[PDB]
Amino acid sequence: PKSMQCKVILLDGSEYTCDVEKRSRGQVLFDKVCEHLNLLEKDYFGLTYRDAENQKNWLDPAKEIKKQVRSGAWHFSFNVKFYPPDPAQLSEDITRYYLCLQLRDDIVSGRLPCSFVTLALLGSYTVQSELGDYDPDECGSDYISEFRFAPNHTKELEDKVIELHKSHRGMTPAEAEMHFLENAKKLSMYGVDLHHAKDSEGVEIMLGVCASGLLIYRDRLRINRFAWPKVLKISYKRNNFYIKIRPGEFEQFESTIGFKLPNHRAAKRLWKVCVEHHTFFRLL
Numbered sequence: 580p581k582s583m584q585c586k587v588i589l590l591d592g593s594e595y596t597c598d599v600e601k602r603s604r605g606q607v608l609f610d611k612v613c614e615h616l617n618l619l620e621k622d623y624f625g626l627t628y629r630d631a632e633n634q635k636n637w638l639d640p641a642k643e644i645k646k647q648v649r650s651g652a653w654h655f656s657f658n659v660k661f662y663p664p665d666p667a668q669l670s671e672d673i674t675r676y677y678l679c680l681q682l683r684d685d686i687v688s689g690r691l692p693c694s695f696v697t698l699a700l701l702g703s704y705t706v707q708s709e710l711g712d713y714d715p716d717e718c719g720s721d722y723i724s725e726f727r728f729a730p731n732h733t734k735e736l737e738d739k740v741i742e743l744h745k746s747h748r749g750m751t752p753a754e755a756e757m758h759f760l761e762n763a764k765k766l767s768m769y770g771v772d773l774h775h776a777k778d779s780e781g782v783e784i785m786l787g788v789c790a791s792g793l794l795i796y797r798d799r800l801r802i803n804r805f806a807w808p809k810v811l812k813i814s815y816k817r818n819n820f821y822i823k824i825r826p827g828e829f830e831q832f833e834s835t836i837g838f839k840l841p842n843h844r845a846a847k848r849l850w851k852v853c854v855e856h857h858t859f860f861r862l863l
């Protein structure tokens with residue numbers, strides 16, 4: 580039996596290495612990573628790889644790894660796939676812990692925009708979880724944390740983290756992680772997967788996919804939101820992605836909103852993440 584070496588970037592930035600038989604389905608590797616992580620609530624998570632076009636793709640657990648990575652390296656990342664709208668309802672603290680690590684990266688990367696005060700509050704809960712109670716000894720007026728808190732660090736933000744960290748004395752890691760998630764879950768881009776597209780008139784928009792439904796970001800004004808109940812069906816053809824929307828009750832016919840994606844692959848990728856998120860919605 581011939582086995583391929585797999586390298587997986589974990590949410591703490593460490594690398595897990597294992598082998599799978601070369602015709603292995605994605606689930607085989609995913610099970611090995613989750614066992615390494617002591618993770619039972621596996622449904623929220625997945626592995627990504629980078630394609631020949633360098634786009635992040637989800638590794639489909641039901642398909643051969645080799646028919647997805649194709650010409651590319653067997654290099655993957657471990658990631659949150661379905662962000663729980665209410666993380667307090669997860670059964671295990673360790674689930675919440677990996678969700679916090681993912682969200683920290685969402686924040687530092689700028690995928691999850693955040694006010695100054697929310698960056699400092701989230702950062703203060705991370706410090707409480709990682710270092711425990713505030714200690715003046717490892718913190719003068721000139722202190723800068725090793726922790727990455729934001730896409731752009733300022734001394735003002737470092738000071739605000741320390742100020743809020745002082746208020747969390749006696750908080751356990753599980754408690755701090757739960758506070759982190761109660762704040763993060765409210766942010767308007769929490770759990771939103773963004774895709775570049777053009778509307779039917781050729782104007783550049785972003786489509787967001789999340790637990791609640793689909794968002795069309797025309798700009799900061801003119802955000803269109805379709806709760807999953809309103810979304811009839813979703814399809815792709817060539818470079819095109821089509822959303823059918825239920826009529827208002829007493830209306831005869833659904834509406835169709837069409838979008839142009841960069842290429843056929845970007846259209847199929849959006850379709851798949853939409854179908855996967857809708858099935859998530861129906862199981863809540």
Ligand SMILES: C(#Cc1ccccc1)CN1CCCCC1
Binds near residue numbers: 765769770792793794
């Ligand atoms: C959204 C949405 C949405 C809301 C209504 C219809 C379609 C999409 C994103 N938001 C993140 C914070 C928690 C609530 C869900």
